[PDB]
Design an enzyme around this catalytic site. Structure first.
Site, PDB file in Angstrom:
ATOM      1  N   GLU A 123      -2.366   5.642  -2.449  1.00  0.00           N
ATOM      2  CA  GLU A 123      -3.467   6.551  -1.658  1.00  0.00           C
ATOM      3  C   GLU A 123      -3.240   7.571  -2.491  1.00  0.00           C
ATOM      4  OE1 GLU A 123      -2.135   8.669   1.183  1.00  0.00           O
ATOM      5  OE2 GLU A 123      -4.073   8.681   2.285  1.00  0.00           O
TER       6      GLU A 123
ATOM      7  N   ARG B 223       0.833  -1.218  -0.150  1.00  0.00           N
ATOM      8  CA  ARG B 223      -0.059   0.002  -0.069  1.00  0.00           C
ATOM      9  C   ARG B 223       0.754   1.286  -0.066  1.00  0.00           C
ATOM     10  NH1 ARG B 223      -3.296   4.715   2.931  1.00  0.00           N
ATOM     11  NH2 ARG B 223      -0.664   5.028   2.931  1.00  0.00           N
TER      12      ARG B 223
ATOM     13  N   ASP C 212       1.601   4.922  -0.015  1.00  0.00           N
ATOM     14  CA  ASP C 212       1.159   6.243   0.974  1.00  0.00           C
ATOM     15  C   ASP C 212       1.511   7.391   0.128  1.00  0.00           C
ATOM     16  OD1 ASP C 212       0.171   7.634   3.527  1.00  0.00           O
ATOM     17  OD2 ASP C 212       2.229   8.562   2.921  1.00  0.00           O
TER      18      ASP C 212
ATOM     19  N   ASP D  58      -7.945   8.046   8.256  1.00  0.00           N
ATOM     20  CA  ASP D  58      -8.114   9.530   8.080  1.00  0.00           C
ATOM     21  C   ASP D  58      -9.388  10.009   7.736  1.00  0.00           C
ATOM     22  OD1 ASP D  58      -5.044   9.689   7.875  1.00  0.00           O
ATOM     23  OD2 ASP D  58      -5.170   8.970   6.011  1.00  0.00           O
TER      24      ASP D  58
HETATM   25  O1  LIG Z   1       2.794  14.317  11.281  1.00  0.00           O
HETATM   26  C1  LIG Z   1       2.290  13.772  10.313  1.00  0.00           C
HETATM   27  C2  LIG Z   1       1.207  13.129   9.915  1.00  0.00           C
HETATM   28  O2  LIG Z   1       1.285  12.091   9.131  1.00  0.00           O
HETATM   29  C3  LIG Z   1       0.491  11.132   8.795  1.00  0.00           C
HETATM   30  O3  LIG Z   1      -0.417  11.011   7.795  1.00  0.00           O
HETATM   31  C4  LIG Z   1      -0.513  10.492   6.375  1.00  0.00           C
HETATM   32  C5  LIG Z   1      -1.815   9.707   6.293  1.00  0.00           C
HETATM   33  O4  LIG Z   1      -2.074   8.830   7.468  1.00  0.00           O
HETATM   34  C6  LIG Z   1      -1.750   8.921   5.123  1.00  0.00           C
HETATM   35  O5  LIG Z   1      -2.792   7.925   5.132  1.00  0.00           O
HETATM   36  C7  LIG Z   1      -1.582   9.891   3.864  1.00  0.00           C
HETATM   37  O6  LIG Z   1      -2.769  10.725   3.940  1.00  0.00           O
HETATM   38  C8  LIG Z   1      -2.749  12.074   3.360  1.00  0.00           C
HETATM   39  C9  LIG Z   1      -2.886  11.980   2.092  1.00  0.00           C
HETATM   40  O7  LIG Z   1      -1.863  11.500   1.347  1.00  0.00           O
HETATM   41  C10 LIG Z   1      -2.893  13.637   1.573  1.00  0.00           C
HETATM   42  O8  LIG Z   1      -3.458  14.008   0.268  1.00  0.00           O
HETATM   43  C11 LIG Z   1      -3.891  14.445   2.591  1.00  0.00           C
HETATM   44  O9  LIG Z   1      -5.139  14.595   1.928  1.00  0.00           O
HETATM   45  C12 LIG Z   1      -5.477  15.883   1.582  1.00  0.00           C
HETATM   46  C13 LIG Z   1      -5.963  15.788   0.142  1.00  0.00           C
HETATM   47  O10 LIG Z   1      -4.782  15.762  -0.795  1.00  0.00           O
HETATM   48  C14 LIG Z   1      -6.699  16.986  -0.155  1.00  0.00           C
HETATM   49  O11 LIG Z   1      -7.276  17.139  -1.660  1.00  0.00           O
HETATM   50  C15 LIG Z   1      -7.751  17.281   0.839  1.00  0.00           C
HETATM   51  O12 LIG Z   1      -9.018  16.369   0.356  1.00  0.00           O
HETATM   52  O13 LIG Z   1      -7.500  17.191   1.968  1.00  0.00           O
HETATM   53  C16 LIG Z   1      -6.747  16.027   2.464  1.00  0.00           C
HETATM   54  C17 LIG Z   1      -6.878  15.767   3.909  1.00  0.00           C
HETATM   55  O14 LIG Z   1      -6.639  14.423   4.291  1.00  0.00           O
HETATM   56  O15 LIG Z   1      -3.724  14.264   3.920  1.00  0.00           O
HETATM   57  C18 LIG Z   1      -3.773  12.826   4.233  1.00  0.00           C
HETATM   58  C19 LIG Z   1      -3.860  12.726   5.741  1.00  0.00           C
HETATM   59  O16 LIG Z   1      -2.233  13.056   6.005  1.00  0.00           O
HETATM   60  O17 LIG Z   1      -0.451  10.486   3.985  1.00  0.00           O
HETATM   61  C20 LIG Z   1      -0.190  11.343   5.303  1.00  0.00           C
HETATM   62  C21 LIG Z   1       1.491  11.557   5.110  1.00  0.00           C
HETATM   63  O18 LIG Z   1       1.872  10.878   4.243  1.00  0.00           O
HETATM   64  C22 LIG Z   1      -0.439  10.787   9.940  1.00  0.00           C
HETATM   65  O19 LIG Z   1      -1.573  10.113   9.754  1.00  0.00           O
HETATM   66  C23 LIG Z   1      -0.626  11.736  10.887  1.00  0.00           C
HETATM   67  O20 LIG Z   1      -0.970  11.304  12.036  1.00  0.00           O
HETATM   68  C24 LIG Z   1       0.690  12.548  11.211  1.00  0.00           C
HETATM   69  O21 LIG Z   1      -0.086  13.637  11.964  1.00  0.00           O
END
Ligand SMILES: OC[C@H]1O[C@H](O[C@H]2[C@H](O)[C@@H](O)[C@@H](O[C@H]3[C@H](O)[C@@H](O)[C@@H](O[C@H]4[C@H](O)[C@@H](O)[C@@H](O)O[C@@H]4CO)O[C@@H]3CO)O[C@@H]2CO)[C@H](O)[C@@H](O)[C@@H]1O
Ligand SMILES: OC[C@H]1O[C@H](O[C@H]2[C@H](O)[C@@H](O)[C@@H](O)O[C@@H]2CO)[C@H](O)[C@@H](O)[C@@H]1O
Ligand SMILES: OC[C@H]1O[C@H](O[C@H]2[C@H](O)[C@@H](O)[C@@H](O)O[C@@H]2CO)[C@H](O)[C@@H](O)[C@@H]1O
Ligand SMILES: OC[C@H]1O[C@H](O[C@H]2[C@H](O)[C@@H](O)[C@@H](O)O[C@@H]2CO)[C@H](O)[C@@H](O)[C@@H]1O
Ligand SMILES: [Ca+2]
Ligand SMILES: [Ca+2]
Length: 686
Positions: free
Chosen positions: A257, A227, A229, A328
């Site tokens: 993702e 998977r 990320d 998320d």
């Molecule tokens: O301190 C750092 C944090 O890092 C961790 O976050 C991870 C997620 O768990 C992953 O599943 C993934 O998710 C991202 C995603 O890749 C990213 O696109 C973003 O999404 C945006 C989206 O692009 C935008 O179009 C709009 O819709 O808002 C969305 C918000 O979700 O965010 C996702 C969530 O982070 O990648 C990130 C980092 O790779 C971890 O979960 C956290 O606990 C930690 O705080």
């Protein structure tokens, strides 16, 4: 082995994935628990470690919790070593319990276990017919501040204990120093930091080679899938080169993702799923399912539109990974909501096209808001819930009824609250009826199906108020009442006689690699496999059985091919399209063109002498190119996956709609590196 065997790492369509947040599942080894302020055994503070590990998972695989449910694959937190710092985010202490703050991709996170624990995990799983998928996040390392090197671990990157470098004084340029993204554009979200996470520069050969080496370690450890990320945040060309490295070595099912919000439909998302070599987490499916069964902000016509649309937009709709919630999003089940909503959404997802994934605890009706409330410790291991039972009755159908794993989807009856659909593949059919209206029954008349005449018992056995179905001649069902909140599943299975291809994996590889073709009716004696018009038979076909064929890709020119098989008797199958034969191993190269001025709505693209570049076909040119971040207009740039060590001729073009303007002069030329990366800088020729 048949298509459904645990050994099939190329096809997950017959599986049901259970997503586990390692730390929050089961602490099987109290000895590896972190200590001090980084630990909370009561798991009351959700940003600290609670102690869940690989031993715990092994324990739950062995005591029958997962197997009892009918789960056949598990997706676990990123296994690599994470930073040890406890990060204070304005008052709150945070740990890397989630596994996303990597420090060394060649070691394990000791809180989860040792490499010995990892190997034991793979063994226990495989022994119980459960495939293992790992989360992998190569977009960044950890939170860093280039001017406050004392912050966290300064995004430091190690190579199996050896310091490669940190965010501060990054003279090697292992990372990006372009600021933080505002998610304003796709380009902006790729070349800038996500929050404060040190963004890796994949155009740096060291980083490029390191990651490709790291993934090979895990493949060798026996994983069945990956998977990926944050795929919307890494260069698409580099990712293709990364998928080629995996496929050309030891192919495994990979899905990425790419976050999509409510009602968002992205063409870039479609193109990436169709051309990168990997499939995606089905956000379009999930957001719509929530709108329809959870928040009630859209109805059955909207669900139908998503089903018909996606089947058209994705070249391989059966490889997209479905879900109703994840780490998320708010948990599907709200504390005060009627449980039947979750049960129905589960039933729908489990019998729908694609690869279903279930977030741990769903079957226990866990509730919770956004991070970190959606990541609580699983409250119990009871097999007595209705949700657990629904999964238990339906998961197995993906293995025994190919219509569910590979079939087309067709609406047969619909209104605002009711949807009745049919899955069909070969001589196999499944009809599912769902009435989201919790207060009103519906009168179903005029239902036509492909079911043979007879009576059909609800596969759920009335668990969700389903009923028996009576099918007359012509497949016409007699009238019936579909209870309020009713869900029913009817099916029919029989041997398929003609070769029917249901799946092919991997979808992209160089000549010589072995691919797996799954389906029904192949027969037991070797037949012939066609890649376009080229026929392959005899020895290159390494294995042949009724439901699965293993064959090596012939040495044909790089390009897109249709696949078809013919049984020993000469009967041909259906055609399976979109297979990409690479020109050889791949390397990621950055192309830059200077002074290419354009008119609004007009963009610069790249084409050239190899299939990886479209073979001079403008309809297949790479782009549009970027021109904001790394280089600014009228200078354009793009990272492309090209065949290693080949001499390539290329040219740039400007496209407006399908109208094209070629660069003048003669083709530019260059020779790709044998490994690592490169950057080609040329001037636009008038
Ligand atoms: O301190 C750092 C944090 O890092 C961790 O976050 C991870 C997620 O768990 C992953 O599943 C993934 O998710 C991202 C995603 O890749 C990213 O696109 C973003 O999404 C945006 C989206 O692009 C935008 O179009 C709009 O819709 O808002 C969305 C918000 O979700 O965010 C996702 C969530 O982070 O990648 C990130 C980092 O790779 C971890 O979960 C956290 O606990 C930690 O705080
Ligand atoms: O009878 C064939 C017909 O079945 C379905 O039509 C339903 C319709 O969806 C219901 O809303 C209601 O109007 O009853 C009809 C049954 O007569 C299919 O939707 C339709 O495509 C098909 O022709
Ligand atoms: O940022 C991408 C952008 O590139 C091109 O836009 C140019 C435009 O052609 C120029 O005339 C000038 O106005 O600058 C723009 C770049 O900032 C494409 O025309 C455009 O569609 C695209 O969004
Ligand atoms: O059709 C293949 C052909 O494409 C390219 O030729 C361009 C040429 O560069 C342009 O100046 C213009 O005349 O259109 C041609 C497309 O037919 C490649 O340059 C060429 O090598 C290749 O054969
Ligand atoms: Ca532990
Ligand atoms: Ca990035």
């Amino acid at each position: 082995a048949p298509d459904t065997s645990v050994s099939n790492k190329q096809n997950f369509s017959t599986d049901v994935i259970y997503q586990i947040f390692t730390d929050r599942f089961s602490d099987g080894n109290p000895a590896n628990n972190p200590t001090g302020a980084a630990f909370d055994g009561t798991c009351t503070n959700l940003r600290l470690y609670c102690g869940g590990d690989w031993q715990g998972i092994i324990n739950k695989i062995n005591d029958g919790y997962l197997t009892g449910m009918g789960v056949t694959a598990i997706w676990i937190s990123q296994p690599v070593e994470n930073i040890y710092s406890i990060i204070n985010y304005s008052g709150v202490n945070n740990t890397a319990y989630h596994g996303y703050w990597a420090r060394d991709f060649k070691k394990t996170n000791p809180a989860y276990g040792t490499i010995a624990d990892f190997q034991n995990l793979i063994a226990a799983a495989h022994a119980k017919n459960i495939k293992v998928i790992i989360d992998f996040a190569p977009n960044h390392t950890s939170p860093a501040s280039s001017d406050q090197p004392s912050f966290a671990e300064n995004g430091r990157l190690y190579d199996n204990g050896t310091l490669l470098g940190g965010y501060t004084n990054d003279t090697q340029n292992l990372f990006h120093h372009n600021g933080g993204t505002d998610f304003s554009t796709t380009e902006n979200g790729i070349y800038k930091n996500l929050y404060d996470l040190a963004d890796l520069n994949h155009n740096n050969s060291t980083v490029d080679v390191y990651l490709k080496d790291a993934i090979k370690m895990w493949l060798d450890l026996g994983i069945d899938g990956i998977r990926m990320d944050a795929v919307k945040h890494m260069p698409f060309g580099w990712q293709k080169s990364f998928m080629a490295a995996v496929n050309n070595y030891k192919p495994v099912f990979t899905f990425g993702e790419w976050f999509l919000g409510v009602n968002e439909v992205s063409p870039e998302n479609h193109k990436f799923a169709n051309e990168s070599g990997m499939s995606l987490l089905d956000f379009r499916f999930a957001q719509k399912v929530r709108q329809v069964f959870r928040d009630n902000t859209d109805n059955m016509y909207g669900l139908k539109a998503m089903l018909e649309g996606s089947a058209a937009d994705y070249a391989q709709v059966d490889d997209q990974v479905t879900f109703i919630d994840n780490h998320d999003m708010e948990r599907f089940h709200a504390s005060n909501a009627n449980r039947r909503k979750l049960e129905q959404a589960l039933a729908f997802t489990l019998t729908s096209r694609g690869v279903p994934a279930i977030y741990y605890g769903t079957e226990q009706y866990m509730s919770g808001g956004t991070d970190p409330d959606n990541r609580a410790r699983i409250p119990s291991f009871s097999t007595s819930t209705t949700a657990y039972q629904v999964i238990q009755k339906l998961a197995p159908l993906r293995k025994c009824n190919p219509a569910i794993a590979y079939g087309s989807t067709q609406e047969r009856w619909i209104n605002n609250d009711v949807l009745i659909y049919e899955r069909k593949f070969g001589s196999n059919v499944a009809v599912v009826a769902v009435n989201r209206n919790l207060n009103a029954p519906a009168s179903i008349s005029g239902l036509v199906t492909s079911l043979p005449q007879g009576s059909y018992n609800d596969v759920l056995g009335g668990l969700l108020n389903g009923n028996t179905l009576s099918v007359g001649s012509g497949g016409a069902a007699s009238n019936f009442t579909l209870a309020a909140g009713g869900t029913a599943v009817w099916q029919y299975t029989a041997a398929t006689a003609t070769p029917t291809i249901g799946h092919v994996g991997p979808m992209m590889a160089k000549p010589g690699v072995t691919i797996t073709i799954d389906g029904r009716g192949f027969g037991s004696s070797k037949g012939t496999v066609y890649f376009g018009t080229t026929a392959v038979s005899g020895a290159d076909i390494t294995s042949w059985e009724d439901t699965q064929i293993k064959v090596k890709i012939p040495a044909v020119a790089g390009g897109n091919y249709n696949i078809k098989v013919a049984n020993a008797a000469g009967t041909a199958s259906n055609v399976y399209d979109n297979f990409e034969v690479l020109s050889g191993d791949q390397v990621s190269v950055r192309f830059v063109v200077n002074n290419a001025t354009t008119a609004l709505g007009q963009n610069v693209y790249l084409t050239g002498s190899v299939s990886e570049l479209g073979n001079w076909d403008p309809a297949k040119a790479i782009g549009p190119m970027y021109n904001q971040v790394v280089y600014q207009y009228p200078n354009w740039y793009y990272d492309v996956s090209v065949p290693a060590g080949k001499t390539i001729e290329f040219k740039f073009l400007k496209k407006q709609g399908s109208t094209v303007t070629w660069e003048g002069g003669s083709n530019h030329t260059f020779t790709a590196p044998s490994s690592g990366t490169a950057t080609i800088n040329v001037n636009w020729q008038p």
